[PDB]
Amino acid sequence: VVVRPAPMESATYSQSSRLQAAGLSPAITLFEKAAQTVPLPDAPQPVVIADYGVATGHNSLKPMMAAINALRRRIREDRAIMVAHTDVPDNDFTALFRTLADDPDSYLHHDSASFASAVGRSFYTQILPSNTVSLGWSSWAIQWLSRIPAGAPELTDHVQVAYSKDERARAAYAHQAATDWQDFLAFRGRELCPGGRLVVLTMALDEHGHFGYRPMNDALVAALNDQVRDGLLRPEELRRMAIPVVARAEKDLRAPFAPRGWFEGLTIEQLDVFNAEDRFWAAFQSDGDAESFGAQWAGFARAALFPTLAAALDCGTGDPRATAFIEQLEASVADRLASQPEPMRIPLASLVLAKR
Amino acid sequence: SVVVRPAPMESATYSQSSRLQAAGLSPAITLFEKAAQTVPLPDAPQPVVIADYGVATGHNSLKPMMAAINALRRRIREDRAIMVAHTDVPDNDFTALFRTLADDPDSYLHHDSASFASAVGRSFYTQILPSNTVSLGWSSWAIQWLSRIPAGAPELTDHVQVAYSKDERARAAYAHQAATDWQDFLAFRGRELCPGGRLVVLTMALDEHGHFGYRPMNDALVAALNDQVRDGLLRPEELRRMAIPVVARAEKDLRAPFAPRGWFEGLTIEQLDVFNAEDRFWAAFQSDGDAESFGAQWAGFARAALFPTLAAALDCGTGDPRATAFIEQLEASVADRLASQPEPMRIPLASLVLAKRA
Lengths: 356, 358
Ligand SMILES: Nc1ncnc2c1ncn2[C@@H]1O[C@H](CSCC[C@H](N)C(=O)O)[C@@H](O)[C@H]1O
Ligand SMILES: Nc1ncnc2c1ncn2[C@@H]1O[C@H](CSCC[C@H](N)C(=O)O)[C@@H](O)[C@H]1O
Ligand SMILES: CCCCCCCC(=O)O
Ligand SMILES: CCCCCCCC(=O)O
Hints:
Two copies of one chain form a homodimer.
Chain A: H1 18-37, E1 47-52, H2 61-72, E2 81-87, H3 93-102, E3 114-120, E4 133-139, H4 167-191, E5 192-203, H5 214-229, H6 235-240, H7 250-254, E6 262-263, E7 266-275, H8 279-287, H9 290-310, H10 320-339, E8 347-355
Parallel strand pairs in A: 1-2, 1-4, 2-3, 4-5
Antiparallel strand pairs in A: 5-8, 6-7, 7-8
Helix pairs in contact in A: 1-2, 5-10, 8-9, 9-10
Bound molecules: S-adenosyl-L-homocysteine (SAH) (2 copies) and octanoic acid (caprylic acid) (2 copies).
One octanoic acid (caprylic acid) binds next to helix 5 and helix 9 of chain A.
Protein name (chain A): SAM dependent carboxyl methyltransferase
Pfam families (chain A): Methyltransf_7 (PF03492)
Binding site for S-adenosyl-L-homocysteine (chain A): 13, 59, 87, 122-123, 139
């Protein structure tokens, strides 16, 4: 009865998350700096790093290595560092453990006293022992709502609430995001060591209050409307489709802390709101390959969003119809964006949080 | 890879098909609970770590974990963190594990609000947890699985279990692989345990007479596989390729790394028992006379634990419908054969308590 989003498409996420990787690049610098200065546990207790919202692990390798390299300048080489990667139960943890074993960039291949574990429990509850996490990292994860809000109006003509014209829906999604953010902070506040640091990167609204990805969202909705026109999609199924993602404004991120600056033992040490460089547009300006441009954007949308859309179908998620739906939708979005390539806004927020 | 490994349990059926395992491990829970009463615990703010080596779906971990946690709660504050680290191979179904921990009312997460869960998908034949952090280790029905089919070992012609093979070279190769695997397992647990820590192991053993047990089951399985070849459902080449990388150890094998002075890599055997588990399927049949249920229980047990490893030998994919049909038919065949002539079976086990030097 509680409707939740779907995890990333395991088969394609590691190959289709270059946008996310490029966008989080500035946050790695913050994370590295946090690792250089954070108070550490008494030797020889293991130093714990937490990665909240790991998916396949591909985009975690660089931030984890940056922290580990920084820590190694401060501690003995034989001292244990434990990385706890967290996601939802239905995330593909086999893909994660294969990434950690097989990818040359894996920290396990670079540091002989580093260790890996996984936690498959929603990060909107406490999932690690209190006072044990020295360094927390979360990129591209917290924009995902814990649920479609209870009693929220069905998004009749849209898949993203920011583009919806239903005021009741907007408020319901906004309240859910506010409660989710409070919950996330409350439990990270318990998990962090005193003096510990948490670096968060999430989807944001820009200075004008816009969600961004405008041509993408237009292409997506149009491609879905074409499937109902061609009889590939039922009108009821399209009505049910919704992405439980909310992008937060600066004011939304600060809300739990106002006005004294603290919430559940945590404070905002640094906050930045910025637009990530549009690499797909930059590449297109260089090579003029419109088909490639369309394929890059469509692949990004597929791995991250399509499993959630496919969950609304009358058939099963393992049903061949769902696979056909995913592949057709990707090809249609690709064609639409390839026909008229345009730059897009990728609004992000980075935060450094510190525990008392 | 040219290194051939066993396959994990069938996650779809293991939680429903592991009552034999659950019943067999029951005596080891008592040992584990007793260990929990006195093992040293780590300095604050470190959680007490309980490691579960070879978790599968988690179904059979709930009882031993809760026994340890209950004992620990008689010693320490209710708000002290306890972390259970469940370990398996990368291709284990960890989603099934986390669903078990969230949904089963027997889950320690539902009974202890300061208990936590994690998973480690890295072979336990290497070190997979930080040195000196584990107070209590548990491993049931896992260490009999070889790290690999031994390199250069002859194809198990006419057999799927090496104990029943007539090939001397195959038997020796499997025995040597088991011996080095056991040394590896001990070496790395010896590093992971806290000084004074305890590890409880339950594994498949050879009985007093050096026998593997499950004889009627073994016979039914071989006969059923032969039926599939004869009926054109399985290629002769595929059956030749099939081998279960499982080795049951005698007392002497278990003691081998420790002999003669009693210690290996900081560990010693505190207690060792070798016993046959009560055959509950036979007991039920003696009570109710339901031969069909008898066959189904045995075949379900074999299916969940063994059939993925057999299916890996097929020329098709493991995700192919042909592999599913193979598993389903093999189960039905074994069930029918055992139902036709119900017989008691030997289930030889060994339980060990290992202690790390203080
Ligand atoms: N409540 C929740 N608890 C844990 N993980 C969640 C979650 N809601 C969403 N996620 C996870 O957040 C991930 C978003 S993809 C981000 C992956 C990676 N950090 C990167 O930067 O590319 C998905 O794996 C999704 O399953
Ligand atoms: N090298 C290895 N490392 C980790 N796990 C292994 C392994 N070899 C086999 N296993 C695991 O051991 C498990 C055996 S099933 C036993 C499950 C449970 N402990 C019970 O008592 O019922 C399987 O999940 C299998 O994947
Ligand atoms: C138009 C919305 C785009 C959402 C991107 C989500 C990225 C991720 O979760 O990895
Ligand atoms: C006849 C061989 C029986 C092997 C049982 C393996 C049980 C398990 O690994 O869970």
